[PDB]
Protein backbone atom coordinates (compact mmCIF):
# COMPACT_ATOMS: atom_id res chain seq x y z
CA UNK A 1 0.00 0.00 0.00
CA UNK A 2 3.15 2.12 -0.43
CA UNK A 3 4.18 2.26 3.24
CA UNK A 4 6.88 4.54 4.65
CA UNK A 5 10.40 4.28 6.13
CA UNK A 6 10.35 0.80 7.66
CA UNK A 7 13.44 0.63 9.84
CA UNK A 8 15.40 -2.23 11.37
CA UNK A 9 17.70 -1.86 14.36
CA UNK A 10 21.07 -3.65 14.24
CA UNK A 11 23.12 -3.47 17.40
CA UNK A 12 26.88 -3.77 16.97
CA UNK A 13 29.08 -5.05 19.83
CA UNK A 14 32.24 -3.42 21.12
CA UNK A 15 34.95 -5.51 19.47
CA UNK A 16 33.98 -5.15 15.80
CA UNK A 17 34.30 -1.92 13.85
CA UNK A 18 32.08 -1.35 10.83
CA UNK A 19 32.67 0.87 7.79
CA UNK A 20 30.45 1.29 4.74
CA UNK A 21 31.13 3.07 1.46
CA UNK A 22 27.57 2.86 0.10
CA UNK A 23 25.50 -0.28 -0.11
CA UNK A 24 28.79 -2.18 0.11
CA UNK A 25 29.32 -3.26 3.71
CA UNK A 26 32.83 -3.87 5.04
CA UNK A 27 33.17 -5.30 8.56
CA UNK A 28 36.43 -5.81 10.48
CA UNK A 29 36.89 -8.00 13.54
CA UNK A 30 39.31 -10.30 15.36
CA UNK A 31 38.88 -13.29 13.02
CA UNK A 32 39.79 -11.60 9.75
CA UNK A 33 37.74 -9.07 7.84
CA UNK A 34 34.65 -9.48 5.71
CA UNK A 35 32.58 -7.64 3.11
CA UNK A 36 29.46 -7.96 1.01
CA UNK A 37 27.84 -6.07 -1.85
CA UNK A 38 24.20 -5.11 -1.35
CA UNK A 39 24.02 -3.07 -4.54
CA UNK A 40 20.83 -4.44 -6.06
CA UNK A 41 18.61 -3.81 -3.06
CA UNK A 42 18.14 0.02 -3.01
CA UNK A 43 17.80 0.50 0.76
CA UNK A 44 19.05 3.42 2.88
CA UNK A 45 21.97 2.37 5.07
CA UNK A 46 23.05 4.53 7.99
CA UNK A 47 24.81 4.19 11.34
CA UNK A 48 24.50 6.33 14.46
CA UNK A 49 26.23 6.53 17.83
CA UNK A 50 29.70 7.65 18.90
CA UNK A 51 31.35 4.30 19.75
CA UNK A 52 28.01 2.65 20.51
CA UNK A 53 27.70 1.49 16.87
CA UNK A 54 23.97 1.30 16.25
CA UNK A 55 23.06 0.59 12.63
CA UNK A 56 19.68 1.35 11.12
CA UNK A 57 18.44 -0.10 7.85
CA UNK A 58 15.76 2.10 6.37
CA UNK A 59 13.56 1.72 3.31
CA UNK A 60 10.95 4.26 2.24
CA UNK A 61 7.80 3.68 0.18
CA UNK A 62 8.34 0.26 -1.35
CA UNK A 63 5.88 -2.58 -1.67
CA UNK A 64 5.03 -5.61 0.43
CA UNK A 65 7.86 -7.51 -1.25
CA UNK A 66 10.24 -4.69 -0.41
CA UNK A 67 9.10 -4.55 3.20
CA UNK A 68 10.00 -8.23 3.12
CA UNK A 69 13.36 -7.22 1.62
CA UNK A 70 14.26 -4.71 4.36
CA UNK A 71 14.56 -7.41 7.04
CA UNK A 72 16.94 -9.52 4.96
CA UNK A 73 19.65 -6.84 5.12
CA UNK A 74 19.30 -6.82 8.91
CA UNK A 75 19.61 -10.59 9.07
CA UNK A 76 22.68 -10.74 6.83
CA UNK A 77 24.41 -8.01 8.82
CA UNK A 78 23.61 -10.04 11.96
CA UNK A 79 25.17 -13.15 10.42
CA UNK A 80 28.26 -11.22 9.31
CA UNK A 81 28.70 -9.84 12.83
CA UNK A 82 28.33 -13.33 14.31
CA UNK A 83 30.90 -14.63 11.83
CA UNK A 84 33.55 -11.95 12.18
CA UNK A 85 33.51 -12.32 15.95
CA UNK A 86 33.17 -16.07 16.27
CA UNK A 87 33.08 -17.86 12.94
CA UNK A 88 30.87 -20.75 11.98
CA UNK A 89 31.45 -24.43 12.70
CA UNK A 90 29.52 -27.29 11.10
CA UNK A 91 29.76 -30.72 12.74
CA UNK A 92 28.93 -33.66 10.48
CA UNK A 93 28.74 -37.26 11.67
CA UNK A 94 29.12 -39.62 8.72
CA UNK A 95 26.43 -42.29 8.87
CA UNK A 96 27.59 -45.54 7.32
CA UNK A 97 26.06 -48.99 6.84
CA UNK A 98 27.97 -52.26 6.30
CA UNK A 99 30.40 -50.31 4.09
CA UNK A 100 32.66 -47.71 5.73
CA UNK A 101 33.28 -44.27 4.29
CA UNK A 102 36.86 -43.00 4.38
CA UNK A 103 37.27 -39.21 4.28
CA UNK A 104 40.65 -37.54 3.83
CA UNK A 105 41.66 -33.92 3.38
CA UNK A 106 44.00 -33.97 0.43
CA UNK A 107 45.66 -30.54 0.25
CA UNK A 108 45.87 -27.80 2.88
CA UNK A 109 42.37 -28.27 4.26
CA UNK A 110 40.68 -27.23 1.02
CA UNK A 111 40.17 -30.44 -0.93
CA UNK A 112 38.01 -33.22 0.53
CA UNK A 113 38.39 -36.72 -0.89
CA UNK A 114 35.70 -39.31 -0.11
CA UNK A 115 36.22 -43.04 -0.62
CA UNK A 116 34.53 -46.43 -0.53
CA UNK A 117 31.07 -44.93 -0.31
CA UNK A 118 28.88 -48.13 -0.46
CA UNK A 119 31.68 -50.01 -2.20
CA UNK A 120 31.78 -47.71 -5.22
CA UNK A 121 35.20 -47.69 -6.84
CA UNK A 122 34.90 -44.08 -8.00
CA UNK A 123 37.09 -41.78 -5.92
CA UNK A 124 35.01 -38.69 -5.21
CA UNK A 125 37.13 -35.52 -5.27
CA UNK A 126 35.18 -32.51 -4.02
CA UNK A 127 36.54 -28.96 -4.08
CA UNK A 128 35.45 -26.67 -1.26
CA UNK A 129 35.09 -22.91 -1.18
CA UNK A 130 37.78 -20.26 -0.74
CA UNK A 131 37.88 -19.05 2.84
CA UNK A 132 36.88 -22.23 4.68
CA UNK A 133 38.85 -25.07 6.31
CA UNK A 134 37.86 -28.68 6.99
CA UNK A 135 39.20 -31.16 9.53
CA UNK A 136 38.40 -34.67 10.65
CA UNK A 137 37.59 -34.14 14.30
CA UNK A 138 38.99 -36.09 17.22
CA UNK A 139 37.33 -37.95 20.13
CA UNK A 140 34.33 -38.92 17.96
CA UNK A 141 33.64 -41.53 15.30
CA UNK A 142 33.89 -40.01 11.75
CA UNK A 143 32.87 -36.48 12.69
CA UNK A 144 33.91 -33.84 10.17
CA UNK A 145 34.13 -30.18 11.17
CA UNK A 146 34.04 -27.29 8.70
CA UNK A 147 35.14 -23.91 10.05
CA UNK A 148 34.96 -20.55 8.34
CA UNK A 149 33.87 -16.95 8.35
CA UNK A 150 31.24 -16.45 5.64
CA UNK A 151 28.22 -18.59 6.43
CA UNK A 152 27.07 -18.68 2.80
CA UNK A 153 30.41 -20.12 1.68
CA UNK A 154 30.63 -22.59 4.58
CA UNK A 155 27.10 -23.89 4.17
CA UNK A 156 27.52 -24.08 0.39
CA UNK A 157 30.51 -26.29 1.10
CA UNK A 158 28.42 -28.49 3.41
CA UNK A 159 25.72 -28.71 0.75
CA UNK A 160 28.37 -29.72 -1.79
CA UNK A 161 29.48 -32.53 0.51
CA UNK A 162 25.97 -33.84 1.17
CA UNK A 163 25.11 -33.69 -2.53
CA UNK A 164 28.35 -35.43 -3.36
CA UNK A 165 27.16 -38.27 -1.14
CA UNK A 166 23.87 -39.16 -2.83
CA UNK A 167 22.54 -42.66 -3.51
CA UNK A 168 21.37 -43.37 -7.06
CA UNK A 169 18.78 -45.88 -8.33
CA UNK A 170 17.88 -47.23 -4.89
CA UNK A 171 15.40 -46.67 -2.16
CA UNK A 172 16.52 -43.71 -0.12
CA UNK A 173 14.44 -44.74 2.88
CA UNK A 174 16.61 -47.83 3.02
CA UNK A 175 20.31 -47.22 2.12
CA UNK A 176 20.45 -44.24 4.49
CA UNK A 177 24.04 -43.41 3.64
CA UNK A 178 25.83 -40.11 3.22
CA UNK A 179 27.58 -37.33 5.08
CA UNK A 180 25.01 -35.07 6.69
CA UNK A 181 25.07 -31.82 8.66
CA UNK A 182 24.42 -32.70 12.28
CA UNK A 183 25.18 -29.52 14.22
CA UNK A 184 25.55 -25.81 13.44
CA UNK A 185 27.47 -23.63 15.85
CA UNK A 186 30.27 -21.20 16.57
CA UNK A 187 34.04 -21.56 16.60
CA UNK A 188 34.52 -20.25 20.13
CA UNK A 189 32.11 -21.96 22.51
CA UNK A 190 30.02 -20.40 25.33
CA UNK A 191 29.39 -17.25 23.27
Amino acid sequence: MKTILSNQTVDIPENVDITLKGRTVIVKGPRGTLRRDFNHINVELSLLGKKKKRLRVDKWWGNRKELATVRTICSHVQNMIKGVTLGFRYKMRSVYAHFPINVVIQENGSLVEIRNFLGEKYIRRVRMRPGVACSVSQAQKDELILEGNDIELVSNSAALIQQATTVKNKDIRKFLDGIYVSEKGTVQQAD
Partner: protein, 50 residues
Protein backbone atom coordinates in the same frame (compact mmCIF):
# COMPACT_ATOMS: atom_id res chain seq x y z
CA UNK B 1 23.42 -48.69 12.44
CA UNK B 2 23.12 -46.21 15.37
CA UNK B 3 19.43 -45.23 15.83
CA UNK B 4 20.23 -41.60 16.67
CA UNK B 5 22.07 -41.36 13.36
CA UNK B 6 19.09 -43.15 11.82
CA UNK B 7 16.91 -40.38 13.26
CA UNK B 8 19.26 -37.86 11.65
CA UNK B 9 19.24 -39.52 8.22
CA UNK B 10 15.48 -40.02 8.30
CA UNK B 11 15.21 -36.35 9.26
CA UNK B 12 17.06 -35.44 6.07
CA UNK B 13 15.43 -37.96 3.72
CA UNK B 14 12.16 -39.37 5.12
CA UNK B 15 9.86 -36.97 6.99
CA UNK B 16 8.87 -34.73 4.11
CA UNK B 17 5.50 -33.90 2.61
CA UNK B 18 4.89 -34.99 -0.98
CA UNK B 19 2.43 -33.15 -3.20
CA UNK B 20 -0.01 -35.32 -5.14
CA UNK B 21 -0.02 -33.00 -8.13
CA UNK B 22 3.58 -31.84 -8.66
CA UNK B 23 5.32 -34.88 -7.01
CA UNK B 24 7.97 -32.68 -5.37
CA UNK B 25 9.58 -33.15 -1.96
CA UNK B 26 8.92 -30.14 0.19
CA UNK B 27 9.12 -29.94 3.99
CA UNK B 28 7.34 -31.54 6.97
CA UNK B 29 5.45 -28.32 7.82
CA UNK B 30 4.83 -26.95 4.32
CA UNK B 31 1.34 -26.45 2.94
CA UNK B 32 2.03 -25.64 -0.70
CA UNK B 33 4.09 -27.07 -3.54
CA UNK B 34 6.43 -24.23 -4.42
CA UNK B 35 6.69 -25.25 -8.08
CA UNK B 36 5.06 -23.38 -10.95
CA UNK B 37 4.33 -26.64 -12.76
CA UNK B 38 1.29 -27.33 -10.60
CA UNK B 39 0.63 -23.84 -9.31
CA UNK B 40 0.90 -23.73 -5.51
CA UNK B 41 -1.76 -26.27 -4.60
CA UNK B 42 -2.69 -27.23 -1.06
CA UNK B 43 -2.97 -30.91 -2.00
CA UNK B 44 -0.38 -32.95 -0.11
CA UNK B 45 0.28 -36.36 1.43
CA UNK B 46 2.90 -37.62 3.91
CA UNK B 47 5.90 -39.57 2.71
CA UNK B 48 5.49 -43.29 3.19
CA UNK B 49 7.33 -45.17 5.94
CA UNK B 50 8.79 -48.65 5.63
Amino acid sequence: IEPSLRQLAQKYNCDKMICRKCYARLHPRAVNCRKKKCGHTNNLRPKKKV
